[PDB]
Design a protein around this nucleic acid. Structure first.
Ligand SMILES: Nc1nc2c(ncn2[C@@H]2O[C@H](COP(=O)(O)CP(=O)(O)OP(=O)(O)O)[C@@H](O)[C@H]2O)c(=O)[nH]1
Lengths: 400, 620, 710
RNA sequence: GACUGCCUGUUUUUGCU
RNA sequence: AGAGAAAUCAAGGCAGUU
C-alpha cells in the first residue's frame, strides 16, 4: 500500500541520514521534539514591523502549487531555510495568493476544524440579552469552568479519553478503564473527517478544547454556569450587570432489617488538627437491588461482608466500577473506610475520589474480601467482567 | 558490567526496561530480571505447534504488539499485572517467579497460572508438569550457572532480598562529591546544628509617625533643553494641494526658499544640502538616495574611528577608574507653556480610529463612551502631536530595513478631512546596521517650527522657509534613535488609554450612582491648582492629563521610572492623610531620599516635583 | 503631581494608573555588568557585621551569627540558627495539611518526575559551549555528556538525571567529543529533494570532533558557575540590575526543590506567590469586620533580598521539614545539594571594569589595577568570582517566600501576612496602638532574624486599615484595577496574524476580567490594537501586500488583509474565522482554501504558548485560533552562520527528521508523553511491522514490505 | 595597512525565575 | 557631532590579494 511504502522509505531515510539521533532512547522524544536553535519567542513584539517587510519574510514547506513567479512577483525561494529540514522561504503575499488561487478541501473537514469555534459563535448568537442595569456591583473572583464542554470529564481522564478517540488500538486495558466512555463516541462522530495522519496534530487540540474544563478565575456577581462564564467580560463588571436568560447507581434498599447506620470516624492528622468523616454502613441483614444501564441484580448484606452477589449483564460487558460503587455503599472493602491510603485525607470529596481511583487501579481488595474458587460455572472473572474464558473465577456469585 | 552467564542481547534489552540506578541493589534486580527473561526465552526454544511458536513471550515487549497478540487470542491483560509468557497450546498463561523457599505453592494471582523455581533449579510440582523435561534441564543449567556467579561475587543476600521484596528508591552521594559540596560550608550534607531551638528577644527602635508629607528637593542649574526626538507643541504643518505624498513633496521642493536664521554648533548649517537632495529624490520618485559628501557630517559616518584615533592621540597616563557624571539641570520655564499649548483647541479631529463592530447593546454603550472620549481629546494640539509622532515613528521603523547603507527619506505627511496634505516635516534615515537593543540608528529630522527659543532648542538649527508668501521656520537636528524607541513610539497612540480610563471610571461611577448612563456628564472636580483648591470640568482636566502623559511618555528615562516608582508610595500616603488617617514609619524611614535620587536633569520630573511640593504638606 | 490628585469625585488611589510612564521607551542597559555583579557580591559581605568590615566577612562560610550581631538599624546579611530551627518547627506545627501534601508529592509525585521538564525552560548557561543556549539544546548536550562519560543510559525520570549528575563528579577526568563545522565560511549548495523544473537546494554541513577534556575540578567549577546577564527593559528602577542563569548540572535539583516549595506554598494561606494566591488578598481585604479595634495595614518591600539571604538558612529549614515529616536520609540528601552548590557559587564576572586614561577607555579585569572592589581579588577564579553569602539572583523565590513565612509564625504576631518575594503586606488587628507598634517591630526584627531585611523607606503603615499596595495592586476599601500595568502588552505579537489577534483579544479580555479595564477602556484598547495590527502586517496605505491584492483581484476578507473590523467588545473570545463565517463574511470557497490542510504556509503550534509582557514573569495564554493559511512562521535568523558552532543546525535538522518519522507512526505522543522503553530505532521498527501486519493486505505484500525494511 | 569579494541584522559573553 | 546616562552605539566578522 502506498502510505506503508512511504513510511518504509521515510524510516530508511531516517536510518541513513541520522544514525546517531535514531540511536537515542524513545523517551528522549519529549526533549528533542523541541530541539531548535531558533529564538523567535524572545521579545518578538519589537521585531514584527521590519521582519514582515524583509525580503523572504516567511517560512514555507516546498510545494508545487506555488509558482516561482506569479504576475511578476517572486512568490517563493529555491533555497531551504537554515536549520529547517523541509521548509524554505517565500514572500509574504503567499498567504494572500493561496486565499484565491489555492487548492480546496472537503466541506466536512472545514466543519471539523471549525467545530469548537463555531459552537462558541452559535452560543453567542443563540441567547437573548437583557437590559443593562447600572449600579455599584461588587464583583468577586471565583474559580469557574470557563469553556462549556460536550460532556463532563475528570481532569485525569482527558488523556485516556483522547487516546481512545484517536488510537484505540495503541492503549492498555487500564487506560481504557480510566477513559470516559459516553463522551468518546460524540467526539468520534464529530471528529471523524479530520482524524487523519495529516491532521492528527490539529485534531487533538480541538478535541481537548471541547473536553477540557479549565478552571479560570473570573469575576462574578451571580453564580455562573459553564455557559455564562466565557462571556463574563461583558455581562458583569464594577458598574453594570446585564441579566442574561453513589456516582451513577440506584440503591433501592428494599428489604433491610435495619436502616443505614452512620459510624462517624475521626482521622487525626495531629492532636490539634483532626478530620471527621462519617461513612454509611449496613447493620444486620439487607437485600439491595442495584441497576446500572443494562446491568441489574441484587446482593445480600451480612454485616460489612458481601455474602453473595448475582447480576444480569450482557456478555463481555465491563462491570468494575458498578461493583466498586456496590462496595462503597455498605463499606464492604478496605482500605477506604476505616484506614487511610497511607496519607491522611482532607475532605470527604477528596477521600471518595481517592477511594475510587485507588480501587479502580487495583481491585485486589474486592477479590480478597469477596471470594474466589476453581471452577467454570461462575459468571465473572478476577478482572470483574462478565462471561469470558478465564481461570480462578470469583466465588460466591450466581446468575439471576 | 554484564555477567558472562547472561546473554548480551537480553542485557542490552533490559538496560532501559526499569531504572536500575535509583533502586536499592539495582544491579542485582537487573540480573534477576535477566534471569527471568532468559528462562522465558529459553522456554519455547524452537518449540512450536500448529503453525506458530508454542509459547509467546510478553516480558519486555512493546505493549502495543502485546495488546495486538492478546486481541488475536481474545483475552485482555492489564499492565500492572501481566503474565510473563502465555501458552496458546493449553490456552493458559504463566509467570516465571523465582522463590528461594520453593514451599510457597500458594498462587500469587488467579489470572495466570504461576510457575516457580528454587534458585538452584528445582521447580514446583505443577511447574514440572506444565513443562517438558528438556526445558527443566535447561532451567537447571541456567540456575546453577547463575548460582556460581552469585557465590563468586558474594551477593547471596542481595539476591534473596530482591526476589523477596519489591524495588526501593535511593539516591546516593559519593565520598568524592561530598567533600566538594562541603568545601564552602561549616555544616554537613544533613545540617545538624547542636543549638537549642529558641527565638531570641531582640531590642529594636520605635516607630515614628510621618506628621507632614516629605518635600522633594529642587536641583539648581541651567534650564533643561528639549531632549525629545520630535518638536512637540512647537510643531506646525504646511497646507498643500490634495494629492499623494510625492505630489506634495515636489510642490514643497519647487515653491520654497531656504535660508539659515540660526546655526547651532551641534548641527552644522551645511547639512541642509542633504535635506534638499532627499526632497528632490523623493519628488522624482525614488525615496532611497545615495550618499553625498555632507552625509558623513550629517549622520556621523566613520565617526567611531575618528574619535578612537583622537582618543589614542590624546593620552594622559594614569588609567583611573571611570567616573561618569550626570549634569544636574533645574526645571526649565517652557514646561508650563508646553502644557498650556498642548491643551489648545484645534479645528479638526486628530484621532481617527476605525470603529469596532456592534452586535450587542453592551458594545453600543462601549463605543459611545469611546466616541465621546475621542470627541473630547481629538480636537486638541496634543492629539495632533501624537499623530505626527506616530507617522514619524512608523514611516521610519517600517522602512527601516534594519540593514542598509543608503540614506532614506520618510516624510511626515497627514491629511485633513478636506483632503489637503499637511507636511509636518521629514525624517532622514541614514546608514544603519543596528543589531543590539542599544544600537542607535542615525537620523536627521527636519521639522516645521512655530517659534524658536534658543534656551529650549540649543542643538536645533533654524532655517527660514518661504512657501507662497508664507514664512515658516524649519528646524534640522542630528539624532540617533534606537530600534526599541522607534518601536515604542510607533505605538504612541497607547497613551490615550490612561486618561480614557480615568474618564471612563468617572462616567461609569456617575452612571452607577444614578442607575443610568448619561455620557454627557460634566462633573466638577476640585484640584490644588496654584496652591488653592480650584475646580475643573473633567473635559480640560482629561485633556491636560493627556498632555502630561504624552510629555511623560516621550521623556521616559530611568530617572522618570524610578521617580514614579518611589512617588506612588508618597501619593498613597497623601491619600491616606487626606482621609484623616495617620501614617507611621520604621526607624530609618526617609521615603523622600529614594525619590530625590531620581530628580537629576529630566524636565518633566522637575515639573512633577514642583507640582508635588506646591501642595499642602500637612492635612490637619 | 497636582493634577493626579483629585479632591472630589474619584479618589487619588484610582489615579495611581497615571503614575506610570509606560508606553514610552523602557530603560535599557549599556556596557558591562561587571560593576553591578561586583556590587551585588560585595553587598552581602558588607552587611554581615554591624560595623562594615569586608575583609573579616570574606572568611565566613556559614552566615550564622549571634543574636546581638544583627544590625537592627540597616541591612544585615545572615541568620540565627536557633531562631531558624524554632521558626521552622512552629511553621511545621501549623499548616499540617500543607506538610501532608508535601509528603504526598515526595512519595507519589517526585518518583515520576521526568527530566524532560527541563526542556520547557529558557536560555541556560552551557558548560560545553561556554555560552547561553536554548534549554533543549543544553539538556541534549548534557545528557549526551553524562551518557558518554558514565557509559550507561539516562533514565527518563529526573531522579535518574540527578543521580547521574551526582555520579559523574565521582570520576577523575571526563570528555565530551562534540561536533564542529571546520569552515563555516564555505557554504556549499547541493541539488536535492527536487529536480522537476523547480530545483530545490539545501546547504551541506561538514563536521569535526571537539574532543574536549574536563577534570573533576573544572567540571565542578562549571557546575558552580552561573552566567550573568543584564536585565534589559526593566521598568521601575533608576539603577539597572543583573540577572544570572545557572548551568544545566544543577537545574534538575533546583526544579525538585522549587516544585516541593510549590506544593507547600499552594496550600498555605500566607503566600501570594501562587498564581491563584494573589486573589486571596482580596478576601483578606474584604475581611474588614473589625469590632472597633485598632487595625493597621503595613505594605512594604524588602531590600537586598537576594543579598541578605544565606542559602544555609533555607537549607536548614528544608532539612527540618524533611526530618519532622519522616522522610528517609536520601530525601534530605537530595534537597540539600542545590543550596550547598550555590553556597560555593561562582558568579561570572563581566568583560571587565571600565578604566579610563583621559578620554579612551579599556576593559580590564578585576585583579588588574586598583578599584573599589580590592577586597574581592582573593575570590577570583579565572573570569568568575565566588561569593558564599547571598543569593545573587532569584532562582529560589518560592523557598525564599517559604523562609519569610516560617519567620512569620510566632506567638506575638497575630495578624494576616501575604508574602510574594520582595513585596508583602500585613494586616494587624490589635486592641491598642502600642500593641500594634510592638507587633510591627516584632515583625521587623523577626524578618531580620533570618535575613529578610525590609527596606525602611519602602514600608508604610496606615493605622486605619484600608489603603495599601501589593504587586502594583492598590487597595482602597477594595482593589482598584490598574490599566497601566499591562499597557506594554497591547502591541501585537510577532508570530503570525491569527496568533497575534488571538493574543491581543485575550489580553484585553483578561484585563477586563481582572478589573484593570472596563467598557470604554477595553473598546479603545481594541480600536488601537486593530490599527497597530493592520499597520504592522502591511494592510494600511499603499504597500506590497495591498499592491499584490490590487493587481490580482484578491479582495480583502480578513482583518490582517485590511477588511472591516469583525470583533466587537462582546466577542473577544470568538475566533475571527468562525465569526466571519457566521456573519456571512467568508464564503465556503475561501474557507476550503485557507483552511485546507494541504497549505504549504501554515505552521502547526500549541494552544498554550509563552507570553512575557516585557522582561516580566513568564505567563501562559490560550491560542485557540484555527490553523488557517495565515498561521505561518517567520523566517529563521541567519546570524548562526560564520560561527564554528553552526553544526547545531545539522543536529536540529536531523532531530526534526526523527520527529517527522515519529508523530506519524505513534498517534499517542501528541496526547501524552513518550513512555516506551528502548531506542528510537527499535520502537519505530516494531511499530512499523505492527502497522503493516495489522493492515488488510496480501501476505506476500506484507512480506515484501518487511523485506524492504532495514 | 587598504581593498576586492561573501555573510549578518535577537543567536556577538546578553530577556533567567 | 549626536543619542545617552553610571557606559555603550556611531557597523561588525570571514576568504583572497597585499
Ligand atoms: N529570578 C528573578 N527574580 C527577580 C527578577 N526581578 C526581581 N526579582 C526578585 O525580586 C527581588 C530583587 O529585588 P532587590 O534584591 O533588588 C530588592 P529591592 O526591590 O528593595 O531593590 P533595592 O532597594 O534597589 O535593593 C528578589 O527577590 C528577586 O528574586 C527577575 O527578573 N528574576
Amino acid at each position: 500500500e502506498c502510505t506503508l511504502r512511504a513510511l518504509v522509505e521515510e524510516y530508511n531515510g531516517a536510518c541513513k541520514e541520522a544514525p546517531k539521533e535514531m540511536s537515542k532512547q524513545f523517551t528522549d522524544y519529549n526533549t528533542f521534539k523541541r530541539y531548535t536553535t531558533s529564538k523567535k519567542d524572545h521579545a518578538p513584539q519589537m521585531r514584527l514591523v521590519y521582519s514582515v517587510r524583509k525580503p523572504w519574510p516567511i517560512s514555507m514547506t516546498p510545494s508545487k502549487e506555488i509558482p516561482l513567479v506569479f504576475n511578476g512577483t517572486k512568490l517563493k525561494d529555491t533555497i531551504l531555510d537554515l536549520g529547517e529540514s523541509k521548509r524554505t522561504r517565500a514572500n509574504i503575499v503567499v498567504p494572500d495568493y493561496w486565499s484565491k488561487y489555492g487548492s480546496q478541501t472537503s466541506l466536512e473537514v472545514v466543519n471539523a476544524i471549525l467545530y469548537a469555534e463555531d459552537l462558541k459563535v452559535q452560543r453567542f448568537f443563540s441567547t437573548e440579552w437583557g437590559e443593562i442595569r447600572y449600579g455599584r456591583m461588587l464583583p468577586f473572583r471565583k474559580p469557574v469552568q470557563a469553556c462549556p464542554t460536550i460532556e463532563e470529564v475528570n481532569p485525569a481522564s482527558i488523556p485516556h479519553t483522547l487516546l481512545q478517540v484517536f488510537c484505540p488500538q495503541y492503549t492498555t486495558l487500564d487506560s481504557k478503564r480510566k477513559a470516559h466512555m459516553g463522551a468518546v463516541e460524540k467526539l468520534k462522530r464529530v471528529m471523524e473527517p479530520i482524524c487523519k495522519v495529516q491532521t492528527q496534530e490539529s485534531a487533538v487540540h480541538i478535541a481537548r478544547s471541547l473536553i477540557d474544563s479549565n478552571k479560570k478565575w473570573l469575576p462574578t456577581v451571580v453564580d455562573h454556569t459553564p455557559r455564562t462564564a466565557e462571556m463574563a467580560h461583558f455581562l458583569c463588571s464594577k458598574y453594570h450587570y446585564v441579566h442574561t436568560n453513589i456516582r451513577s447507581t440506584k440503591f433501592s434498599i428494599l428489604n433491610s432489617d435495619h436502616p443505614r447506620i452512620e459510624v462517624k470516624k475521626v482521622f487525626s492528622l495531629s492532636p490539634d488538627v483532626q478530620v471527621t468523616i462519617p461513612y454509611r454502613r449496613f447493620k444486620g441483614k439487607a437485600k439491595v437491588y442495584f441497576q446500572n444501564d443494562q446491568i441489574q441484580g441484587y446482593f445480600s448484606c451480612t454485616d460489612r461482608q458481601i455474602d453473595e452477589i448475582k447480576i444480569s449483564a450482557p456478555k463481555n460487558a465491563p462491570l468494575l466500577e458498578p461493583l466498586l460503587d456496590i462496595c462503597y455503599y455498605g463499606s464492604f472493602i478496605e482500605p477506604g473506610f476505616e484506614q487511610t491510603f497511607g496519607f491522611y485525607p482532607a475532605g470527604k470529596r477528596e477521600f471518595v475520589d481517592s477511594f475510587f481511583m485507588h480501587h479502580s487501579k487495583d481491585h485486589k481488595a474486592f477479590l480478597i474480601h469477596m471470594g474466589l474458587d476453581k471452577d467454570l460455572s461462575l459468571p465473572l472473572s478476577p478482572e470483574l467482567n462478565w462471561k469470558e474464558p478465564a481461570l480462578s473465577k470469583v466465588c460466591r456469585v450466581t446468575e439471576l | 558490567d554484564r555477567p558472562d552467564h547472561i546473554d548480551s542481547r537480553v542485557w542490552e534489552l533490559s538496560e532501559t526496561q526499569e531504572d536500575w540506578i535509583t533502586q536499592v541493589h539495582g544491579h542485582v534486580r537487573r540480573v534477576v530480571e535477566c534471569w527471568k527473561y532468559t528462562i522465558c526465552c529459553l522456554i519455547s526454544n524452537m518449540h512450536t505447534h500448529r503453525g506458530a511458536p508454542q509459547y509467546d513471550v510478553f516480558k519486555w515487549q512493546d505493549r502495543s504488539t502485546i495488546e495486538w497478540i492478546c486481541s488475536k487470542k481474545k483475552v485482555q491483560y492489564p499492565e500492572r499485572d501481566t503474565p510473563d509468557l502465555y501458552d496458546n497450546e493449553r490456552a493458559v498463561a504463566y509467570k516465571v517467579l523465582l522463590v528461594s523457599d520453593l514451599s510457597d505453592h500458594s498462587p500469587t494471582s488467579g489470572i495466570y497460572h504461576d510457575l516457580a523455581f528454587n534458585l538452584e533449579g528445582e521447580a514446583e510440582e505443577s511447574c514440572a508438569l506444565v513443562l517438558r523435561g528438556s526445558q527443566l534441564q535447561d532451567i537447571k543449567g541456567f540456575l546453577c550457572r547463575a548460582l556460581e556467579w552469585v557465590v563468586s561475587n558474594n551477593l547471596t543476600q542481595e539476591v534473596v532480598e530482591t526476589i523477596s521484596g519489591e524495588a526501593k528508591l535511593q539516591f546516593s552521594v559519593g565520598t568524592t562529591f561530598r567533600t566538594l559540596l562541603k568545601r564552602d560550608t561549616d555544616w554537613d550534607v544533613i545540617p545538624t546544628p547542636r543549638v537549642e531551638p529558641n527565638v531570641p528577644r531582640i531590642e529594636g527602635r520605635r516607630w515614628t509617625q510621618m506628621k507632614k508629607l516629605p518635600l522633594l528637593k529642587e536641583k539648581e542649574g541651567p534650564p533643561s533643553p528639549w531632549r525629545a526626538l520630535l518638536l512637540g507643541a512647537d510643531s506646525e504643518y504646511i497646507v498643500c494641494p490634495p494629492g499623494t505624498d510625492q505630489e506634495a513633496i515636489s510642490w514643497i521642493h519647487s515653491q520654497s526658499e531656504i535660508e539659515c536664521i540660526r546655526e547651532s554648533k551641534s548641527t552644522p548649517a551645511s547639512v541642509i544640502t542633504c535635506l534638499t537632495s532627499s526632497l528632490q529624490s523623493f519628488a522624482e520618485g525614488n525615496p532611497v538616495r545615495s550618499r553625498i559628501h555632507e552625509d558623513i557630517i550629517a549622520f556621523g559616518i566613520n565617526k567611531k574611528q575618528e574619535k578612537k584615533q583622537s582618543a589614542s592621540s590624546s593620552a594622559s597616563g594614569e588609567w583611573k577608574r571611570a567616573e561618569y557624571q550626570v549634569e544636574e539641570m533645574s526645571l526649565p520655564p517652557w514646561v508650563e507653556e508646553e502644557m498650556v499649548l498642548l491643551r489648545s483647541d484645534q479645528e479638526d479631529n486628530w484621532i481617527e480610529l476605525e470603529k469596532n463592530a456592534i452586535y450587542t447593546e453592551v458594545d453600543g454603550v462601549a463605543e459611545g463612551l469611546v466616541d465621546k472620549y475621542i470627541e473630547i481629546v481629538g480636537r486638541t494640539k496634543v492629539a495632533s502631536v501624537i499623530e505626527k509622532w506616530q507617522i514619524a515613528a512608523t514611516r521610519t521603523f517600517s522602512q527601516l530595513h534594519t540593514d542598509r547603507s543608503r540614506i532614506t527619506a520618510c516624510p511626515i505627511i497627514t491629511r485633513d478631512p478636506s483632503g489637503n496634505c499637511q507636511f509636518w516635516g521629514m525624517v532622514l534615515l541614514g546608514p544603519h546596521h543596528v543589531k543590539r537593543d542599544t544600537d542607535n540608528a542615525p537620523l536627521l529630522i527636519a521639522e516645521i517650527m512655530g517659534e524658536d527659543t534658543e534656551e529650549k532648542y540649543p542643538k536645533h538649527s533654524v532655517f527660514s522657509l518661504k512657501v507662497e508668501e508664507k514664512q515658516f521656520l524649519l528646524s534640522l537636528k542630528i539624532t540617533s534613535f534606537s530600534r526599541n524607541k522607534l518601536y515604542t513610539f510607533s505605538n504612541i497612540r497607547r497613551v490615550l488609554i490612561q486618561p480614557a480610563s480615568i474618564y471612563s471610571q468617572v462616567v461609569l461611577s456617575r452612571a452607577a450612582e444614578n442607575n443610568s448612563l448619561n455620557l454627557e456628564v460634566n462633573p466638577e472636580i476640585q484640584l490644588y491648582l496654584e496652591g488653592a483648591q480650584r475646580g475643573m470640568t473633567l473635559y480640560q482636566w482629561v485633556r491636560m492629563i493627556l498632555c502630561l502623559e504624552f510629555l511623560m511618555a516621550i521623556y521616559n528615562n530611568p530617572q522618570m521610572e524610578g521617580f514614579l516608582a518611589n512617588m506612588r508610595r508618597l501619593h498613597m500616603s497623601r491619600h491616606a492623610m487626606m482621609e484623616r488617617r495617620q501614617v507611621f514609619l520604621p526607624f530609618g524611614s526617609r521615603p523622600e531620599d529614594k525619590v530625590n535620587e531620581c530628580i537629576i536633569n529630566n524636565p518633566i520630573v522637575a515639573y512633577l516635583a514642583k507640582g508635588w511640593n506646591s501642595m499642602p504638606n500637612v492635612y490637619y | 503631581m497636582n493634577l493626579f490628585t483629585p479632591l472630589s469625585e474619584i479618589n487619588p488611589t484610582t489615579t495611581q494608573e497615571l503614575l506610570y510612564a509606560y508606553t514610552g521607551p523602557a530603560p535599557v542597559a549599556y556596557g558591562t555588568r561587571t560593576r553591578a555583579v561586583l556590587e551585588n557580591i560585595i553587598r552581602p559581605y558588607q552587611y554581615f557585621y554591624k560595623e562594615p568590615n569586608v575583609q573579616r566577612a570574606l572568611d565566613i562560610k556559614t552566615g550564622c551569627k549571634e543574636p546581638e550581631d544583627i544590625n537592627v538599624e540597616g541591612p544585615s546579611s545572615g541568620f540565627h540558627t536557633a531562631s531558624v530551627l524554632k521558626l521552622a518547627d512552629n511553621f511545621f506545627r501549623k499548616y499540617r495539611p500543607a506538610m501532608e501534601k508535601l509528603k504526598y508529592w515526595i512519595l507519589v509525585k517526585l518518583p515520576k518526575l521526568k527530566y524532560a521538564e527541563l526542556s520547557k525552560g529558557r536560555q541556560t548557561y552551557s558548560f560545553i559551549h561556554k555560552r547561553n543556549l536554548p534549554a533543549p539544546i543544553a539538556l541534549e548536550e548534557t545528557v549526551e555528556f553524562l551518557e558518554q562519560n558514565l557509559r550507561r543510559k539516562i533514565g527518563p525520570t529526573l531522579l535518574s538525571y540527578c543521580q547521574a549528575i551526582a555520579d559523574v563528579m565521582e570520576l577523575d577526568e571526563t570528555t565530551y567529543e562534540g561536533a564542529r563545522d571546520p569552515r563555516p565560511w564555505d557554504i556549499q549548495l547541493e541539488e536535492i529533494d527536487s529536480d522537476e523544473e523547480d530545483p530545490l537546494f539545501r546547504q551541506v554541513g561538514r563536521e569535526e570532533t571537539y574532543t574536549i577534556k574536563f577534570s573533576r575540578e573544572e567540571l565542578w567549577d562549571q557546575m558552580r558557575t552561573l552566567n550573568t546577564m543584564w536585565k534589559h527593559l526593566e521598568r521601575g528602577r533608576l539603577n539597572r540590575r543583573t540577572i544570572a542563569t545557572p548551568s544545566m548540572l544543577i537545574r534538575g535539583f533546583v526544579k525538585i526543590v522549587e516544585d516541593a516549595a510549590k506544593e507547600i506554598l499552594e496550600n498555605v494561606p500566607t503566600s501570594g506567590v501562587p498564581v491563584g494566591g494573589e486573589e486571596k488578598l482580596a478576601k483578606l481585604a474584604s475581611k474588614q469586620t473589625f469590632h472597633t479595634a485598632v487595625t493597621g495595614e503595613l505594605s512594604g518591600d524588602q531590600e537586598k533580598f537576594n543579598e541578605c539571604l544565606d542559602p544555609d538558612a533555607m537549607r536548614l529549614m528544608w532539612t527540618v521539614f524533611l526530618r519532622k515529616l519522616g522522610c528517609p536520609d536520601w530525601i534530605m540528601e537530595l534537597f540539600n545539594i542545590p543550596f550547598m552548590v550555590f553556597k560555593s557559587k561562582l558568579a561570572d564576572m563581566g568583560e571587565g571594569l571600565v578604566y579610563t586614561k583621559g578620554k579612551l577607555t579599556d576593559r580590564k579585569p578585576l585583579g588588574e589595577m586598583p578599584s573599589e572592589f580590592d577586597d574581592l581579588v582573593r575570590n577570583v577564579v579565572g573570569n568568575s568570582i565566588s561569593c558564599r553569602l547571598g543569593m545573587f539572583m532569584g532562582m529560589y523565590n518560592l523557598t525564599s517566600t517559604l523562609l519569610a513565612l516560617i519567620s512569620i509564625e510566632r506567638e506575638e504576631l497575630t495578624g494576616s501576612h501575604v508574602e510574594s518575594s520582595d513585596d508583602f503586606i500585613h494586616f494587624f488587628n490589635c486592641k491598642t496602638h502600642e500593641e500594634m507598634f510592638k507587633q510591627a517591630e516584632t515583625l521587623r526584627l523577626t524578618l531580620k532574624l533570618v535575613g529578610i531585611n525590609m527596606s525602611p523607606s519602602k514600608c508604610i503603615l496606615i493605622s486605619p486599615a484600608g489603603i495599601g499596595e501589593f504587586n502594583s495592586k492598590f487597595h482602597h476599601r477594595d482593589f482598584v484595577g490598574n490599566v497601566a500595568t499591562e499597557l506594554p502588552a497591547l502591541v501585537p505579537n510577532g508570530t503570525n496574524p491569527m496568533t497575534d489577534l488571538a493574543m491581543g483579544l485575550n489580553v484585553i479580555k483578561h484585563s477586563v476580567n481582572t478589573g484593570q479595564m472596563n467598557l470604554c477602556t477595553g473598546a479603545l484598547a481594541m480600536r488601537i490594537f486593530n490599527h497597530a495590527y493592520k499597520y504592522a502586517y502591511m494592510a494600511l496605505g499603499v504597500t506590497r501586500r495591498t499592491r499584490f491584492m490590487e493587481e490580482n483581484a484578491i479582495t480583502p476578507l480578513l482583518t490582517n488583509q485590511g477588511a472591516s473590523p469583525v470583533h466587537s467588545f462582546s466577542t473577544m473570545h470568538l475566533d475571527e474565522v468562525a465569526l466571519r463565517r457566521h456573519l456571512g463574511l467568508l464564503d465556503e470557497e475561501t474557507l476550503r482554501r485557507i483552511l485546507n490542510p494541504n497549505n504549504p504556509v501554515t505552521q502547526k503550534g500549541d494552544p498554550s504558548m509563552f507570553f512575557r509582557i516585557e522582561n516580566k514573569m513568564p505567563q501562559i495564554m490560550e491560542d485557540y485560533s484555527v490553523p488557517s493559511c495565515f498561521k505561518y512562521t517567520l523566517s529563521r535568523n541567519r546570524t548562526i552562520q560564520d560561527k564554528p558552532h553552526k553544526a547545531l543546525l545539522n543536529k536540529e535538522e536531523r532531530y526534526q527528521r526523527v520527529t517527522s518519522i515519529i508523530n506519524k507512526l505513534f498517534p499517542e505522543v501528541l496526547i501524552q508523553e513518550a513512555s516506551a522503553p528502548g531506542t528510537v530505532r527499535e520502537s519505530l521498527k516494531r511499530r512499523l511491522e505492527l502497522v503493516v501486519e495489522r493492515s488488510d493486505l496480501d501476505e506476500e505484500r506484507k512480506k515484501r514490505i518487511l523485506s524492504r525494511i532495514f
